[PDB]
Amino acid sequence: VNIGAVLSTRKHEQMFREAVNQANKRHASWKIQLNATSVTHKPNAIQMALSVCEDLISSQVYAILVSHPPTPNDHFTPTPVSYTAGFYRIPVLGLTTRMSIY
Amino acid sequence: SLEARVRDGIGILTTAASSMLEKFSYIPEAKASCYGQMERPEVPMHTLHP
Amino acid sequence: NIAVMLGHSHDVTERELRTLWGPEQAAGLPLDVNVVALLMNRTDPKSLITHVCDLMSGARIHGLVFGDDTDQEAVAQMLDFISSHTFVPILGIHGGASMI
Amino acid sequence: VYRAAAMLNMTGSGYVWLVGEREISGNALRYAPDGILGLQLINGKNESAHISDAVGVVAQAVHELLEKENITDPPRGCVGNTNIWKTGPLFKRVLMSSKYADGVTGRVEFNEDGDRKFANYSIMNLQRRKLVQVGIYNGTHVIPNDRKIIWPGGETEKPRGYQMSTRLKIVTIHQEPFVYVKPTLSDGTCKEEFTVNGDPVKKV
């Protein structure tokens, strides 16, 4: 299984790798192991959308986690991922993007 | 059928352009850049909603 | 200016039939117009991005009268996203760009 | 609005203010009367706990998911496919019903609307700059600390919100026997009234 997620920074990517290693210590996955993938944010939303498409979808992910970057409330951090994954039915997980519109 | 729909849409866009010309006498463009633009937010040049 | 997007998934009524005429009519004060139209197929997200960006590159002040035949309603949200950071008007007519 | 309220003498000796999370942060702190109750969230900005809880709940959902009727591979490439995979909403169905007790932030329960239920809040209050904790929220029950809420104006006693303004604007209507209407005196007053038995007649 692949649970690749988009994170704010590389340190968060290493933290995600450590978390998936801990999860694979307490459990198991007999389907292409349980390796994950990471990717950062880009100032252009269109580039972000095409990147998440070509990265997560080509890896055949089962879910994804999205976090708000240190950008001061751009209002458009998780939306491209939400739309791209909403074309399909793959769920997304918001880390800290508290907004009533979502 | 679809022919009437596309005709109506074309007429709507043309009438909006004519109204914009009558109210502004200048129609700007919207072909700056798609990939990696990072130029600027919107401007009130040709907001055709009204 | 003005562009038309089609692709005729079910009915093959397209191409030269709608290519000509357009906004010519008999308007008292018209302007220079064109009915440049393309063709497409079953919608894909990256494909939609590429097609709309190519149309924007090839268009000066054109809008869009895009339509579709897929039953998925996500096309409306994706097209609203496209209209957000492009400032090119679009109108939905058939199929996917019809679930309001 | 804080600047306007400070201008219009809306803070001081009453008028207890109540400010959301996005009202006591950044520039809002510069222009703010004291005594505001700036409600905020405990450990909201931290993400390591959130990441651990999310990966745990995802693993639990997958472990509940593989034992179903049939699961197919998710779509790949997103350029050569058009139809959603059949097991899409099933993943949401199993993920919603995930009371993952294994967590570092508490019992993770997801409301059907898609948000997180049972969130531990934290009351905050500002008294001549700086913030002090006042209570802990555990769900449908608020508890205060032993501290005293310094209200906006220095009054230690809790200011109530009842005045009633003791000034009523009363509306009537011209009628024959009940309430009369006569032209006013040219001087600008009402007088010269006497009852049949002999008494003043009260008029407004």
Globular, elongated, flat, extended or rod-shaped: what is the shape of chain B? flat
Tell the overall outline of chain A.
globular
Q: Give Rg of chain A in angstroms.
A: 14 Å
Oligomer: part of a larger assembly
Largest beta-sheet characterization of chain A: 2 strands, parallel
Q: Spell the H/E element sequence of chain B.
A: H
The computed structural class of chain B is mainly alpha
Number of strands of chain A: 4
| Residues in helices of chain B, as a percent range | 40-55%
Order of helices and strands of chain A: EHEHEHE
What is the percentage of strand-forming residues of chain B?
under 5%
PDB class: membrane protein/immune system
Keywords: Channel, antibody, MEMBRANE PROTEIN-IMMUNE SYSTEM complex
Entry title: Human GluN1-2A with IgG 003-102 WT conformation
Chains A, D: Glutamate receptor ionotropic, NMDA 1
Structure explained in plain terms:
- Chain B: Belongs to the glutamate-gated ion channel (TC 1.A.10.1) family. NR2A/GRIN2A subfamily.
- Chain B: It comes from Homo sapiens.
- Chain B: This is Glutamate receptor ionotropic, NMDA 2A.
- Chain B: It is found in: Cell projection, Dendritic spine; Cell membrane; Synapse; Postsynaptic cell membrane.
- Chain D: It comes from Homo sapiens.
- The structure is cut from a larger assembly and holds two copies of chain A and two copies of chain B.
- Chain A is built from three helices and four strands.
- Chain A is mainly alpha-helical and 102 residues long.
- In chain A, the strands form two sheets. Chain A has a two-stranded parallel ribbon. A two-stranded parallel sheet of chain A has the order 3-4.
- The radius of gyration of chain A is 14 Å and the shape is globular.
- At the A-C interface, helix 2 and helix 3 of A face helix 2 and helix 3 of C.
